[PDB]
mmCIF file of C-alpha atoms and ligand atoms in Angstrom:
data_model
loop_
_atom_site.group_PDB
_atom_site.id
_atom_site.type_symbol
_atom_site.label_atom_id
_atom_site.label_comp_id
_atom_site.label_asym_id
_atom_site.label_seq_id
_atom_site.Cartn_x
_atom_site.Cartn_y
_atom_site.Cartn_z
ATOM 1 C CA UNK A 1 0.000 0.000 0.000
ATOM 2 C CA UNK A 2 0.743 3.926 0.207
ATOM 3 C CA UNK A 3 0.541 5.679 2.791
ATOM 4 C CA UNK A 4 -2.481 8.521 2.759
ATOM 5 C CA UNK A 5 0.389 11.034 2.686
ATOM 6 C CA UNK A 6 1.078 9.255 -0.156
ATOM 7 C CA UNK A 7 -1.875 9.339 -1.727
ATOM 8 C CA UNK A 8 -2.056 12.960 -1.287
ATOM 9 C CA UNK A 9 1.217 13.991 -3.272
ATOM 10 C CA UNK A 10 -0.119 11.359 -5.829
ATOM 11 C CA UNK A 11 -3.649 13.394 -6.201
ATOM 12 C CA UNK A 12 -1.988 16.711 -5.749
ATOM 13 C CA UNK A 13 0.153 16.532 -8.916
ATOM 14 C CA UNK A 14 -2.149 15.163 -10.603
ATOM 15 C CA UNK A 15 -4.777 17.325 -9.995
ATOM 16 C CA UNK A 16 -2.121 19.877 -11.661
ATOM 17 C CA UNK A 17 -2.285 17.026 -14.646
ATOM 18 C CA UNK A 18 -5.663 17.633 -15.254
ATOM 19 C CA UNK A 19 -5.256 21.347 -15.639
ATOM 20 C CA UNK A 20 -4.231 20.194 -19.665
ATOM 21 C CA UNK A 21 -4.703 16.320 -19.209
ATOM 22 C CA UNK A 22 -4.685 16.425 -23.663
ATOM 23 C CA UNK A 23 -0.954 18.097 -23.485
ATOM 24 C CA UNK A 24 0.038 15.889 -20.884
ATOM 25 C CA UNK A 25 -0.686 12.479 -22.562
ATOM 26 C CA UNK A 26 0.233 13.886 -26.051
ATOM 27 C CA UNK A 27 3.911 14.181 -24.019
ATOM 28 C CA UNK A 28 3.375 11.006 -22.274
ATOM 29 C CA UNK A 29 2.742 8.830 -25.310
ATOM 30 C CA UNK A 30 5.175 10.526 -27.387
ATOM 31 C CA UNK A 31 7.929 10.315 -24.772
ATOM 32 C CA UNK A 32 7.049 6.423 -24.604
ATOM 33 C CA UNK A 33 6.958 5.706 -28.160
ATOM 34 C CA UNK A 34 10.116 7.656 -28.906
ATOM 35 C CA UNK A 35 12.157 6.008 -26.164
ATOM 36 C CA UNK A 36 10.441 2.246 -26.681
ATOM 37 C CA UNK A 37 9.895 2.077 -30.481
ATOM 38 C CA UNK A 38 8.169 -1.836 -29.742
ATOM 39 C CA UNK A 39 5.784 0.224 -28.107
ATOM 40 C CA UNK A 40 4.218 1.608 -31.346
ATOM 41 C CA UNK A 41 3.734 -0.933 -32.960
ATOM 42 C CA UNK A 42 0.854 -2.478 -30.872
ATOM 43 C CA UNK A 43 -1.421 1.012 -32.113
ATOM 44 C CA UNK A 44 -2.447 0.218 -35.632
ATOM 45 C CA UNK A 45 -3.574 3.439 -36.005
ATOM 46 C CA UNK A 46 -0.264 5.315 -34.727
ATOM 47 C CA UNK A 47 2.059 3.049 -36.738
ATOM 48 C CA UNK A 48 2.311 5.496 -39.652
ATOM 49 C CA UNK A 49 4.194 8.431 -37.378
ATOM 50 C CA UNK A 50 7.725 7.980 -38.175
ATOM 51 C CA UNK A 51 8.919 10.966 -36.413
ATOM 52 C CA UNK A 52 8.737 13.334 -33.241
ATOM 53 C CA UNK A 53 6.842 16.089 -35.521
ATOM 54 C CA UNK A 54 4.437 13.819 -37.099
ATOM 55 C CA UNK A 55 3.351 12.357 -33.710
ATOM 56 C CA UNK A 56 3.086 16.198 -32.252
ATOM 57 C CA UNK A 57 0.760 17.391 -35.205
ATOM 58 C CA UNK A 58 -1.237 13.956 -34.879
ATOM 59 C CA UNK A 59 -4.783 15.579 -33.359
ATOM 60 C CA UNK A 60 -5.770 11.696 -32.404
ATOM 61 C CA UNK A 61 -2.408 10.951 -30.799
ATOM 62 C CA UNK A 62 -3.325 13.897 -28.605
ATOM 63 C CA UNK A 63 -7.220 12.824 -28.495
ATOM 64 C CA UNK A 64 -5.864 8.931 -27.013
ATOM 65 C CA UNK A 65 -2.988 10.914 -24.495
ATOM 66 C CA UNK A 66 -6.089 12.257 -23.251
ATOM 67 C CA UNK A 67 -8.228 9.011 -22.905
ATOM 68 C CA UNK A 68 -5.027 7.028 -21.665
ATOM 69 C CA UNK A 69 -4.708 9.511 -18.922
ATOM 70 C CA UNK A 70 -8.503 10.222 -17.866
ATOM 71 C CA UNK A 71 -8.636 6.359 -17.674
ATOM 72 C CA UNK A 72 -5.293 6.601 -15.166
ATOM 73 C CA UNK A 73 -6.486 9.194 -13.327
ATOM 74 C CA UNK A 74 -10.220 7.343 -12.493
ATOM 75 C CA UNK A 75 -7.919 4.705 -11.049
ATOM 76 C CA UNK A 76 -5.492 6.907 -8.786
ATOM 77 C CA UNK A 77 -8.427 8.529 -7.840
ATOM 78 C CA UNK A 78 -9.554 5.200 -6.305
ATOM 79 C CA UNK A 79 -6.059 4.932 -4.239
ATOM 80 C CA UNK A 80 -5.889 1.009 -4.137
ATOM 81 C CA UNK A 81 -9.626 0.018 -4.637
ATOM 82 C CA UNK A 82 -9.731 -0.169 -7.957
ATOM 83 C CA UNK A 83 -10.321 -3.887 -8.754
ATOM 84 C CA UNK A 84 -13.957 -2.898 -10.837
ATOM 85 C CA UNK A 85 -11.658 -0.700 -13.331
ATOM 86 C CA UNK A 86 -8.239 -2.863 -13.161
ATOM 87 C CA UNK A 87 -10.027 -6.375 -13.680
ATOM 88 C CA UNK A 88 -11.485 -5.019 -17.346
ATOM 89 C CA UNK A 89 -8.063 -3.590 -18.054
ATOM 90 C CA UNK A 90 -6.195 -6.301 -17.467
ATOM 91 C CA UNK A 91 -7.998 -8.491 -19.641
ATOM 92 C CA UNK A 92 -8.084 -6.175 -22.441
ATOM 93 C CA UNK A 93 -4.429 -5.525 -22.822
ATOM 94 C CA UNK A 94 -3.647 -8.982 -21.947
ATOM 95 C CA UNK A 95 -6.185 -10.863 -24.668
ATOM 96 C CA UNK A 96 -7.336 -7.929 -27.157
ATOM 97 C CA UNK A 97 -3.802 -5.875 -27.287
ATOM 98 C CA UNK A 98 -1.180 -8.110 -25.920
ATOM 99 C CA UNK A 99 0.869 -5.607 -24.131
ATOM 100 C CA UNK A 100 3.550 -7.113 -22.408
ATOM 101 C CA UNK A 101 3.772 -6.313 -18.570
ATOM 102 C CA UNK A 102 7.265 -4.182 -19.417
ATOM 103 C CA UNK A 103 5.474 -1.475 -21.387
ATOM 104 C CA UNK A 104 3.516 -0.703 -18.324
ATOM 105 C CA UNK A 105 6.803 -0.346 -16.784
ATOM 106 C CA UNK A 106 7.613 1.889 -19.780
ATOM 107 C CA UNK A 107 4.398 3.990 -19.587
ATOM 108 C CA UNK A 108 5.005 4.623 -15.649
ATOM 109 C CA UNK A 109 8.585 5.792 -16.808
ATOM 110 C CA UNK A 110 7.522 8.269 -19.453
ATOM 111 C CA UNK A 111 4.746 9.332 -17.081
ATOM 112 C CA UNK A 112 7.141 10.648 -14.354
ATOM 113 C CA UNK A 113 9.775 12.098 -16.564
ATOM 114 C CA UNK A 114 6.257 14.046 -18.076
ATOM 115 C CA UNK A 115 5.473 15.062 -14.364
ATOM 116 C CA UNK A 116 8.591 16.092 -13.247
ATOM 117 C CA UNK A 117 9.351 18.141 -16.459
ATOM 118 C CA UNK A 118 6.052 20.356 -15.949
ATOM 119 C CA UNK A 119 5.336 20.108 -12.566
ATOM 120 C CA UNK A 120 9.231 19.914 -10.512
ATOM 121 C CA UNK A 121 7.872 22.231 -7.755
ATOM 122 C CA UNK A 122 5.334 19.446 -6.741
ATOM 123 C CA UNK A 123 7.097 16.577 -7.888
ATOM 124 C CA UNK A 124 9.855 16.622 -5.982
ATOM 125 C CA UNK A 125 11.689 13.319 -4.697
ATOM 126 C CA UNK A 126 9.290 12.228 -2.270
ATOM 127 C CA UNK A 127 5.891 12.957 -4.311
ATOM 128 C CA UNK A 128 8.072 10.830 -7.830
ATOM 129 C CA UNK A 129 8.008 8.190 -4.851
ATOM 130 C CA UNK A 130 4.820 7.984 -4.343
ATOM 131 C CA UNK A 131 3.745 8.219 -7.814
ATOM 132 C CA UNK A 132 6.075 5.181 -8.635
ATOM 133 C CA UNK A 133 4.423 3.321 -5.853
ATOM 134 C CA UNK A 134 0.939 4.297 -7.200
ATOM 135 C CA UNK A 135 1.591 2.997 -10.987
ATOM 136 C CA UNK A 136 3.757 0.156 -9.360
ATOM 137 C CA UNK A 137 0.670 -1.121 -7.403
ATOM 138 C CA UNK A 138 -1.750 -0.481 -10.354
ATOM 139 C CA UNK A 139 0.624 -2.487 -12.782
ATOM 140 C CA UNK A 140 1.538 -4.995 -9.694
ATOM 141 C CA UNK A 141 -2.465 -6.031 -9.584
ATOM 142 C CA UNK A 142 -2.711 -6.127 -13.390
ATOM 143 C CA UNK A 143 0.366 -8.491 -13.352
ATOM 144 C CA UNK A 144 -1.783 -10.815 -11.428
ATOM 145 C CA UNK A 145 -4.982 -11.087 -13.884
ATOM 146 C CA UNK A 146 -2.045 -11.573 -16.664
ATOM 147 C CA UNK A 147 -0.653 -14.456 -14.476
ATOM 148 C CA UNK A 148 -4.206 -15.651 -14.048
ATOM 149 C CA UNK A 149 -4.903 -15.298 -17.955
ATOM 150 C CA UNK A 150 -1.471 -17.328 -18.305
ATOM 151 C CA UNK A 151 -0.325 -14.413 -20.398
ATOM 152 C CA UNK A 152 3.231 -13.955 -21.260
HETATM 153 C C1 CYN B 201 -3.811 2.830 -23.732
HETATM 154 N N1 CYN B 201 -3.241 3.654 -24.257
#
């Protein structure tokens, strides 16, 4: 678990997130897909952006940063009790996307460099902490269902 100090520097930022939650997750997914080329290849419809530009002047990359994150933020939101959301999740990207557990990993990555970029006066050591923990648990519990699934 996290503490409900924790919690609160979790919520915090991202209540600053959600001040421009569609510049945010255009950042986050370009930040991933850049870094993790694999990555793109599991969105059909991103496949075609070859480069930095094209992915900044794609309107539905920026459209999907913004469902990606709304969808993350529902689930910090629940701080731990989030089984109703996770279980769906989990067997979506395990069976219908096949995302291996590691680009959760990846997404958490690109997600804190994004917060600490915009946000570094509350992001600070102990609130990237928390927010590791937070995305650690949520991927931890999603880990499980995959393990379940007997997805690899
Ligand atoms: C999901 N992006």
């Amino acid at each position: 678990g996290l503490s409900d100090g924790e919690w609160q520097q979790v919520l915090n930022v991202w209540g600053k997130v959600e001040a421009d939650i569609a510049g945010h997750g255009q950042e986050v997914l370009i930040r991933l897909f850049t870094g993790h080329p694999e990555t793109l290849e599991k969105f059909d419809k991103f496949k075609h952006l070859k480069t930095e530009a094209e992915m900044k002047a794609s309107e539905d990359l920026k459209k999907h940063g913004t469902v990606v994150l709304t969808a993350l933020g529902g689930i910090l939101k629940k701080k731990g009790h989030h089984e109703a959301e996770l279980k769906p999740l989990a067997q979506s990207h395990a069976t219908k996307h096949k995302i291996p557990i590691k680009y959760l990993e990846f997404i958490s990555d690109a997600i804190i460099h994004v917060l600490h970029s915009k946000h570094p006066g509350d992001f600070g050591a102990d609130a990237q902490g928390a927010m590791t923990k937070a995305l650690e648990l949520f991927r931890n519990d999603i880990a499980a269902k995959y393990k379940e699934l007997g997805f690899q």
